[PDB]
């Protein structure tokens, strides 16, 4: 950290262009509208009871699993609905839309839960409705991914992210070419770079009193990708241990193969 304050004073921190403010407002309203309770979630959230996810070495609590899979079909649907509201997504072929959602769905869901972290109760709130402790989400299926989402939630309290920063982060996660099978690779790659640049410029506009904010927020993309990859491993475990009848059709569609 030699000459850090001057180097910081010397960086170019451009605001968003008129064309970038189009993406930002559209994305922000796509997020807000598909995060319905997002205004009033803290005021009217039901805590999942203390007996539900309580206490071999890695068996799933089916009562807790059942409570999560009851709400998950709307949760997945909120993500699909978010993607549909972005212009560069809806134009894509059907096979690409599927691949992009299969890749990012848990990444987005986890981000949304983590921004609803409450330091007071040590709880995440899921889909604006269901407040859960770490132990409950762990034993209900997620295992170590529970610990990872909570650790992300705690670390994002400092970042004071608004609806726009969350929205653009979701858009960056959605428009990744890291998945196999995509036809329209260039149109997606070009869309991501447009969101990334718009996002950096909005972060410049916000002026957080936090050193290296933008690099630090980019490290959270890696955290979310690790959540997504690790969840794929847990979903196999869930499919082995939990009865099939507890998996909704949309849940199976998004996370199999």
Phi-psi region of 207 (alpha: psi -120 to 50; beta: other; left: phi over 0): left
Distance CA 71, CA 68 (A): 6
Which of 45, 48, 61, 68 forms a contact with ligand A1H2J (CB under 6 A)?
Answer: 68
Distance CA 115, CA 113 (A): 6
Distance CA 74, CA 78 (A): 6
Q: Give the number of residues in contact with ligand A1H2J, rule: CB under 6 A.
A: 20
The residue among 16 and 140 lying less far from ligand A1H2J, judged by its C-beta, is 140
User: In whole angstroms, how close is the CB of 190 to ligand A1H2J at the nearest point?
Assistant: 26
Q: Is 35 near ligand A1H2J (CB under 6 A)?
A: yes
Nearest residue by C-beta to ligand A1H2J? Answer: 141
Is 55 known to sit in a ligand binding site? Answer: no
The residue among 208 and 225 lying less far from ligand A1H2J, judged by its C-beta, is 225
Q: Which two tokens stand for residue 158?
A: 């400092």
HEC sequence for 114-158: HHCCECCCCEEEECCCEEEEHHHHHHHHHCHHHHHHHHHHHHCCC
By CB under 6 A, name the binding residues for ligand A1H2J: 35, 65, 68-69, 71-72, 75, 78-79, 106, 109-110, 112-113, 126-127, 140-142, 149
Residues annotated in the binding site for 3,3',5-triiodo-L-thyronine, as ranges?
Answer: 78, 127
Residues annotated in the binding site, as ranges?
Answer: 78, 127
């Amino acid at each position: 950290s030699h000459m850090e304050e001057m180097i910081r004073s010397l960086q170019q921190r451009p605001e968003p262009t008129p064309e970038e403010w189009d993406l930002i407002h559209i994305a922000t309203e796509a997020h807000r509208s598909t995060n319905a309770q997002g205004s009033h979630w803290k005021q009217r959230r039901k805590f999942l009871p203390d007996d539900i996810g309580q206490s071999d070495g890695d068996k799933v609590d089916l009562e807790a699993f059942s409570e999560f899979t009851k709400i998950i079909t709307p949760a997945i649907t909120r993500v699909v609905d978010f993607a549909k509201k972005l212009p560069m997504f809806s134009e894509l072929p059907c096979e690409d839309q599927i691949i992009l959602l299969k890749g990012c769905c848990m990444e987005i869901m986890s981000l949304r839960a983590a921004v609803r972290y409450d330091p007071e109760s040590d709880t995440l709130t899921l889909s604006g409705e269901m407040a859960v402790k770490r132990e409950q989400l762990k034993n209900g299926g997620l295992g170590v991914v529970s610990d990872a989402i909570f650790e992300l939630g705690k670390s994002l309290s400092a970042f004071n992210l608004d609806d726009t920063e969350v929205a653009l982060l979701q858009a960056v996660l959605l428009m990744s070419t890291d998945r196999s099978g995509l036809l329209c690779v260039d149109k997606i790659e070009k869309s991501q770079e447009a969101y990334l640049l718009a996002f950096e410029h909005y972060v410049n506009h916000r002026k957080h009193n936090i050193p290296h904010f933008w690099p630090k927020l980019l490290m959270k993309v890696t955290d979310l990708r690790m959540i997504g990859a690790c969840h794929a491993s847990r979903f196999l475990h869930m499919k082995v241990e939990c009865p099939t009848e507890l998996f909704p059709p949309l849940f199976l569609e998004v996370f199999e193969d």
